[PDB]
């Protein structure tokens, strides 16, 4: 189990008032992720801490991040958070007081550059505070080239590890500032109780990483210590023993392929095996206590069902520092309302601390792989209904009520009507030609946003699509209303009955049994579609075809999908016969 | 509630008063036993004989098995809308007012549970399992502290 | 807040002379009476105000997961309406895609 | 305890003092009355409770709950 | 902590001359009786000191030795 | 096989001893300690040597 | 340089899988059998009925 | 490079809140021996403890007597029993046990161990037979 | 068992409160039982409900929709509330013996009363005015005409005096605002809720008999 | 991951000064990337001095071996020396594939 | 791994007809399955396969245990 990347996670109550954590991943599952933490402190300060490979554990005042990228005007910096500096509103007032207070709060570490309006000085200060090799703070200042080198290195680092999912070049600094202002806006919205904090147990903001992702995470740290470091040490030793001008292209090659390949003593294979065997727990690489993000267990061959269930096991993430030893302990072990259809509601350990800790995929649930985000990005940016982020400003978004559009958590533009765009792209996905069937199209009606998700680790299950005649029903209602208004005695004769049903037929059941029909054919024909827990919040599902048949003419219960009831159980839970006739704890 | 006729007393919000009214309305009456005993030969029914003589089981067990489970209560309250804002499950609409959307199980165990009913029952059973699991640890902590304070 | 006219910066309040004297780090002063006599603000029923659910109530008729009831819309005469229940007081709002709203909302 | 997988430890006192104490102080007859509730701990359970009810009931579905001498002897 | 010196070695202890097994029901045993498998009865031993009053009773145990039950293992 | 904290608590609640002694000393690491009684420090005693 | 990855913090390769991975929790685990002196081989004595 | 056997650093957080002058003489520093005590036996008519043996006292008497009969065995009992436990139990029941029960009422600071000596052969026996 | 605030009895919360000797502020399920000081009127359920609702703690903050502190004296005006001078002059006319005093300072709070909470809690404007006036020495309080229906609000402008200011002026003014908000409008401090329960008690009657009373 | 996230550009202080150029040199910049990465199927050696043969999973299970495939890397190293005169010398070497 | 030589419950020699039963059941099933794939036979909601007459013709009595163990036992060679 892993929290969703490129997603703001907020946590209000349980001297820091609130925390907003955003982990940014520029591309697929194998890219380095940068974690930014935004904290409102009781002192009034809003601090942004960026944890990355380059540097971490440094809380910078929020306005300094905007100042380093050229946005030095306080009005423009605050405008990134409130989106309109000349709107009375009610959230705007509260946000403006908080931001004005946070600007003037004195910070112990960034005291000299707090009131600095020149971005070069702030960049230099951050470079000195961040660079490992700058242990002499005064010697280099005499050399102008040294200052330029530090500034360039810091700018490159900032472009690489500050919101890399929104871009990694210098062309997207202002877009990154807009996104950061949006994140601060969301955090302050939660602060004023407009929003509740992020549900830690909900699967709408959760991902499941197995094999490839976890092995890649372990492999990065193992490679950096077993290959890069030995080669660096060998090259250093060769240059210290042999004069640089004496190398004849043979010393370099042997030093490369003998420094790491003679005194291995740790091995890439041995370290990968240790990562696989240790499991999801804290471990020590190079005497550094890092957390192994690989969830593994011994293959206990009690039976074949045990092996299959082990291969379909979803494990909660383990962290040493907190491990959630509060009321959260029994909150995370409960059956969450987002589980049905994706996580088996019955499978769990019945004894010990492992009760509800280990989850099982439901029978029809699948793990999505990373889709081609680039094609959908090109389609969305070329969509006339979507105004690109470069062509719209915060004033236009807030005054015209524009709806933000996200793909894999990246804000790529705004649309006039979020619902229409979401429905049109859902229809395109149903066609399956220009939109891949495994993409998530989520519409947040509370804030009018459309989110496209194609990242790895998405739980997905196929759901039969329920279609209705609501348009014809509404037209008949309008015709009957016109007849009544004209003064007709049998105006009700124009009304038609409501019809909702699936297109699934017993003949397709026989074709599936005959092997001539597959789930891919059903998805291509539009009979069924794949639904993600985040997209499931946009769905109203009939729990069975019996329920759908009962409400066939019920215009007040317009299901979007119909479920097969056995899809809420895992393989081991389905072994129990008449499980719905048994107490569910006994099914566990 | 729809006509704005529910007036909470002093000390409760309309939501709390409505939840209390719903919890009181969905309790099984005493006459739920009448159909059960009309179908049961007490001089011959093994289940009734075990329940009535105190060997095993209780009246709620028989009622759940034969008539219906009823309202699923967790911490004295009904099922919370945790699926989304105002939604308890993907199977029920937002701001649903029916009792079934909030954990009321209308089916007995012998009749079989539907998928949402089974999900609510699984939530209750998982609560039971969690409480049983952490009872051992909490009792161990308290017992060790009390023993060392009193030994 | 007051934004300094020379440098786009926020200026402190520093009530000294019986009125507000907006002081900036660049030394500029604006005086600025009348409009900025409000020093502190706090709304105590946030999370239940009108603008909290404004977007949701606007989008409620188009949300397929919202509860519907068999009630006639007085505007377009549809036989069904979207039913909302927001707040700790369980405010019931009936909305329609035609724009009709049940008085409150 | 219950018979569903429970494991119990058993050790036989070998020394004379421990044996004296086991048969004089720690015998389960001393724990028949609970130290906690001041009441009895043991009694009929499950099949024994139902059997006592079935044996002491006035009537069966077959008439009066009676047995002949042979089956009355077999009870003992 | 639990695995530390105090709690694991002083407040509790590993012991010799002890057995563990699964428990099952036996309605033919009295409430103050326990059914002991014979293989465990030839593993755990009772130390009886030979005196004038018990020599006759303990002699069959000595004669049985380790070959027949009830016997003995060490003297 | 371990006789833990709770087993000792149960045995001492019965007021047993002589079984705590047997199991925890005779069937465990129970030994003999020698103390000088004049300074309280562990003394060195050997009968044979 | 900024592009170099040789001196990259390898603790950052392990992406956070939980929200509060840095907050320190001092309380004891409510599900840990730490004050219960029970052998690990008889853990099914705690199994639910 | 990967080490698995971590030691789990251990932290204590709740601090305790317990509530001429020359170098040292041979009296204040030292004298760990503790002064010897004299046995002040309470007179038989001043005793306040029960004239009935507790189950603890009777059990200890039987255990001590049986352990002594394990190494000894010169017995004053009439009937012959084949176990030291039975012999000790009958000795207690026949009021022939050669032991006494001392109940240390108080140890005084002045160095007196005030005790009550009870004869189990004139005491109530609560044991079963 | 209940898990909500003020009645948190789930888990070992109550036993740990008991065994750890946790202070009063650390208790999550604190309760009290009060007997009427009149043996002959304990039988009236209506009187018991009256007393229970009377001792229920209601503060000023419970009844505030929003509040705004202002640097304006009176004997200028934030533009968003320039319409307040109508009911302000109405209050001046309707309260001849409540003219502003000659120590009125710049600081003053303007609070909007929540009418829904006032209706539900049976809180009257006069109750607020008298529970703040005969409570606060250095203050001058003004209310709108309570006749307000749905659409026009009840506004309470509390004007401060330099006797309170007698540290930064704005910060101490905000602290005074906090002190005023936490004032007890009704009830007894620390009592979030107060229900009425039927008590079973024994009393000896005139015949020397011990009778169990359920009423 | 190897070709993009593991590029090395590190400058180390010169530690030798027993030559005029050695005193001139104060740093050397080591710069290399990886160009070819490929993982093969698990292999094993029988003779201890023979050709590598396919290692089947049952043999790895029996012998306690690791079902691991060889990783072959090809790299391009760029070494740059720096002197106290503003010039730099570049020695560019290409590493052939190696396990 | 095979149909047991005798019924586990009563010891009736059901293994005398185990091979004949297996073959005849395969032949009979082939005449009842239509277009459904062999692995989808346990999923066909229209299938009604009764082996009562086959077992009776084998001479096996109407015993719950014997017919159960005859029709339900898994053959190892059919899965390996
Ligand atoms: Mg058990
Ligand atoms: Zn300025
Ligand atoms: Zn309408
Ligand atoms: Zn000494
Ligand atoms: Zn048979």
mmCIF file of N, CA, C and O in Angstrom, chain K residues 2-7 11-23 55 58-61 66 70:
data_model
loop_
_atom_site.group_PDB
_atom_site.id
_atom_site.type_symbol
_atom_site.label_atom_id
_atom_site.label_comp_id
_atom_site.label_asym_id
_atom_site.label_seq_id
_atom_site.Cartn_x
_atom_site.Cartn_y
_atom_site.Cartn_z
ATOM 1 N N UNK K 2 -6.218 -40.599 -6.266
ATOM 2 C CA UNK K 2 -7.127 -41.431 -7.035
ATOM 3 C C UNK K 2 -8.427 -41.561 -6.259
ATOM 4 O O UNK K 2 -8.504 -41.215 -5.078
ATOM 5 N N UNK K 3 -9.460 -42.056 -6.934
ATOM 6 C CA UNK K 3 -10.664 -42.437 -6.191
ATOM 7 C C UNK K 3 -10.293 -43.537 -5.207
ATOM 8 O O UNK K 3 -9.629 -44.515 -5.598
ATOM 9 N N UNK K 4 -10.665 -43.427 -3.932
ATOM 10 C CA UNK K 4 -10.186 -44.395 -2.940
ATOM 11 C C UNK K 4 -10.637 -45.811 -3.264
ATOM 12 O O UNK K 4 -11.672 -46.030 -3.896
ATOM 13 N N UNK K 5 -9.818 -46.776 -2.840
ATOM 14 C CA UNK K 5 -10.125 -48.183 -3.076
ATOM 15 C C UNK K 5 -11.456 -48.551 -2.438
ATOM 16 O O UNK K 5 -12.276 -49.258 -3.035
ATOM 17 N N UNK K 6 -11.696 -48.075 -1.218
ATOM 18 C CA UNK K 6 -12.962 -48.280 -0.532
ATOM 19 C C UNK K 6 -13.490 -46.927 -0.082
ATOM 20 O O UNK K 6 -12.752 -45.945 0.013
ATOM 21 N N UNK K 7 -14.792 -46.885 0.183
ATOM 22 C CA UNK K 7 -15.403 -45.680 0.721
ATOM 23 C C UNK K 7 -14.778 -45.338 2.067
ATOM 24 O O UNK K 7 -14.629 -46.204 2.932
ATOM 25 N N UNK K 11 -16.263 -48.213 4.089
ATOM 26 C CA UNK K 11 -15.400 -49.261 3.592
ATOM 27 C C UNK K 11 -15.950 -50.064 2.438
ATOM 28 O O UNK K 11 -15.391 -51.120 2.122
ATOM 29 N N UNK K 12 -17.027 -49.613 1.806
ATOM 30 C CA UNK K 12 -17.530 -50.297 0.627
ATOM 31 C C UNK K 12 -16.532 -50.150 -0.520
ATOM 32 O O UNK K 12 -16.006 -49.059 -0.750
ATOM 33 N N UNK K 13 -16.261 -51.223 -1.262
ATOM 34 C CA UNK K 13 -15.243 -51.152 -2.319
ATOM 35 C C UNK K 13 -15.676 -50.336 -3.526
ATOM 36 O O UNK K 13 -15.985 -50.896 -4.580
ATOM 37 N N UNK K 14 -15.697 -49.008 -3.386
ATOM 38 C CA UNK K 14 -16.044 -48.155 -4.515
ATOM 39 C C UNK K 14 -14.944 -48.138 -5.567
ATOM 40 O O UNK K 14 -15.202 -47.777 -6.720
ATOM 41 N N UNK K 15 -13.723 -48.527 -5.205
ATOM 42 C CA UNK K 15 -12.625 -48.538 -6.154
ATOM 43 C C UNK K 15 -12.689 -49.653 -7.173
ATOM 44 O O UNK K 15 -11.913 -49.634 -8.133
ATOM 45 N N UNK K 16 -13.585 -50.624 -6.983
ATOM 46 C CA UNK K 16 -13.776 -51.662 -7.988
ATOM 47 C C UNK K 16 -14.301 -51.083 -9.292
ATOM 48 O O UNK K 16 -13.974 -51.583 -10.373
ATOM 49 N N UNK K 17 -15.117 -50.035 -9.211
ATOM 50 C CA UNK K 17 -15.727 -49.412 -10.374
ATOM 51 C C UNK K 17 -15.202 -48.006 -10.625
ATOM 52 O O UNK K 17 -15.795 -47.268 -11.416
ATOM 53 N N UNK K 18 -14.103 -47.621 -9.972
ATOM 54 C CA UNK K 18 -13.617 -46.248 -10.064
ATOM 55 C C UNK K 18 -13.195 -45.897 -11.485
ATOM 56 O O UNK K 18 -13.545 -44.830 -12.003
ATOM 57 N N UNK K 19 -12.438 -46.781 -12.135
ATOM 58 C CA UNK K 19 -11.990 -46.511 -13.498
ATOM 59 C C UNK K 19 -13.163 -46.504 -14.469
ATOM 60 O O UNK K 19 -13.277 -45.613 -15.323
ATOM 61 N N UNK K 20 -14.048 -47.497 -14.350
ATOM 62 C CA UNK K 20 -15.231 -47.554 -15.200
ATOM 63 C C UNK K 20 -16.106 -46.333 -14.966
ATOM 64 O O UNK K 20 -16.628 -45.737 -15.915
ATOM 65 N N UNK K 21 -16.281 -45.940 -13.702
ATOM 66 C CA UNK K 21 -17.072 -44.750 -13.411
ATOM 67 C C UNK K 21 -16.457 -43.510 -14.035
ATOM 68 O O UNK K 21 -17.169 -42.684 -14.607
ATOM 69 N N UNK K 22 -15.139 -43.349 -13.913
ATOM 70 C CA UNK K 22 -14.485 -42.166 -14.459
ATOM 71 C C UNK K 22 -14.661 -42.095 -15.970
ATOM 72 O O UNK K 22 -15.028 -41.049 -16.522
ATOM 73 N N UNK K 23 -14.434 -43.219 -16.655
ATOM 74 C CA UNK K 23 -14.583 -43.235 -18.106
ATOM 75 C C UNK K 23 -16.024 -42.964 -18.520
ATOM 76 O O UNK K 23 -16.281 -42.142 -19.410
ATOM 77 N N UNK K 55 -24.112 -44.424 -11.518
ATOM 78 C CA UNK K 55 -23.649 -45.093 -10.306
ATOM 79 C C UNK K 55 -24.520 -46.303 -10.001
ATOM 80 O O UNK K 55 -24.017 -47.365 -9.613
ATOM 81 N N UNK K 58 -23.590 -49.085 -12.121
ATOM 82 C CA UNK K 58 -22.337 -49.679 -11.674
ATOM 83 C C UNK K 58 -22.527 -50.722 -10.581
ATOM 84 O O UNK K 58 -21.591 -51.478 -10.304
ATOM 85 N N UNK K 59 -23.700 -50.783 -9.958
ATOM 86 C CA UNK K 59 -23.932 -51.678 -8.848
ATOM 87 C C UNK K 59 -23.650 -51.086 -7.486
ATOM 88 O O UNK K 59 -23.882 -51.761 -6.476
ATOM 89 N N UNK K 60 -23.153 -49.859 -7.427
ATOM 90 C CA UNK K 60 -22.931 -49.188 -6.142
ATOM 91 C C UNK K 60 -24.282 -48.870 -5.510
ATOM 92 O O UNK K 60 -25.186 -48.373 -6.204
ATOM 93 N N UNK K 61 -24.478 -49.142 -4.222
ATOM 94 C CA UNK K 61 -25.786 -48.906 -3.604
ATOM 95 C C UNK K 61 -26.068 -47.420 -3.447
ATOM 96 O O UNK K 61 -25.192 -46.565 -3.592
ATOM 97 N N UNK K 66 -20.771 -43.407 -0.257
ATOM 98 C CA UNK K 66 -20.106 -44.070 -1.374
ATOM 99 C C UNK K 66 -20.219 -43.248 -2.649
ATOM 100 O O UNK K 66 -19.223 -43.028 -3.347
ATOM 101 N N UNK K 70 -17.257 -41.334 -4.645
ATOM 102 C CA UNK K 70 -17.039 -41.724 -6.031
ATOM 103 C C UNK K 70 -17.059 -40.518 -6.960
ATOM 104 O O UNK K 70 -16.205 -40.397 -7.845
#
